[PDB]
Amino acid sequence: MRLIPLKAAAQVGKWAAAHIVKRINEFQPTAERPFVLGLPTGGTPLATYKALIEMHKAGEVSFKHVVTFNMDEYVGLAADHPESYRSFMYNNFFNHIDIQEENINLLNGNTDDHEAECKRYEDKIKSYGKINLFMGGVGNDGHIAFNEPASSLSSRTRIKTLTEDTRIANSRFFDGDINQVPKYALTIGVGTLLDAQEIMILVTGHNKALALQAAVEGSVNHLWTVSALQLHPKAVIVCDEPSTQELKVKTVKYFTELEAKNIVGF
Template sequence: MRLIIRKDYDAVSDHMANYIKNRILEFNPTLDKPFVLGLPTGSSPVGVYKNFVKYYQNGELSFKNVVTFNMDEYVGLPRDHPESYHSFMWHNLFKFIDILPKNVHILDGNAENLEEECKNFEEKMKSYGGVELFLGGIGPDGHIAFNEPGSSLASRTRAKTLAYDTILANSRFFDNNINKVPRMALTVGVGTVMDAREVAVIITGAHKAPALAKCIEEGVNHMWTVSAIQLHPNALIVCDEDATLELHVKTVKYFKSIELVIDDLVGAENVGLQGNVKRYPTPEVTPTREAFYNLPFKK
């Protein structure tokens, strides 16, 4: 697992957006071989989506050969409701970029047969050869998508009854009226997310510090479903300084030191996007331990 620590939400968003942009460019998607990208909703990815729009407008990135699958959708909420995840994605990203509407896949919370809708969603992902990268955010209780505490770590896309705390938290989007909040949602499962060839998670804010600590420093636990990424061979977390408040100091220093080694000793040009060492250089001078730890940490 890779943990990248940045100063604040904007810096986290910039880093994650730039990383995904470079992953897409490196993949060099075509009509016959699209880049399949899993996407979340909520406050966490908004900054990333703003950067995606900027990249497209500046001519840095095209989404014509990108296929997307969204994590979740409310059950029973009209598709054009301002709080539906269809509306969220179109108003925050899709209508500003050149993605083809046929390449956008969002679960239909108004489908006549919800079980069949979830099954078809899984099959559609498989038809593209699986998801290349799944981007996610988490809740303060460590849930990813709508896989709340207690969800099976092997779960697949399904209809899910929402916990009371989730309904209460989401009431802020529904005029603070809990009676307007849907009671159910369709969501990809933890197992669905883990099937992606890469999982990248954004974690920001002091209120999510306990979840990050559980994910990084403790074992895999279905009560903190994001912790499942410990078992993924290619997992990336980008967090801000506030989210590290519950981590041990030595944990924070360890992950920051990894970046220092790459940037100042190995050389970023010798390391692939996903952290794989392409070539190990022979430095002319090896810094002393004291000199190494005096190198400035990234801000």
């Protein structure tokens, strides 16, 4: 894997946005061959989305032939709720770029058959072959997507129960009221994520330091599903200095020296 150790969250967002634009522009997407981009919600990717919007306004990237898949959606929360992941993606990203409505893919957490909706989603991914780049965050508890501790490391898309830790963290988007946070979510699996050609996980803040330690220094295990990135041929973690607090000094030095020429501009 690559670990990109940057100083501040603003730089993580600039690096991630530049990496997405690099992959899209080198791919040269068309209607017949779209670039397929997997996307997360949460607080971590906001700077990346804002950077991508500005790069599009400057004519540096077009999303006209970009197909997107999101990692997850809350179960039982109204789709037009401002904190649904559908609302998050339109308000923070889709409404500000030249993406096509038919190229947006989202999970519906309010159908009468969660298993059929998750299978529909997997089938739609397979209709494009592969996801070319999947961006994600990481939970305090190590999850990627909502693959909470003790998730199968070859799981597919399914309903999952959010941990109390996840719901406490996400309550900051519900006026700090954990009773407003949904208890379940539909989420792509660890196997679904590993099927992508490239995975880029953004990690910012001291709250994620134990998760980053598990990802980088820990072994492969189902309690910290971010550790599954060790199995993937093309995984990138982009992190800020507060997220490194639980790593060894030699670990940060190793990756800082490896990436020196790739971070000196950020």
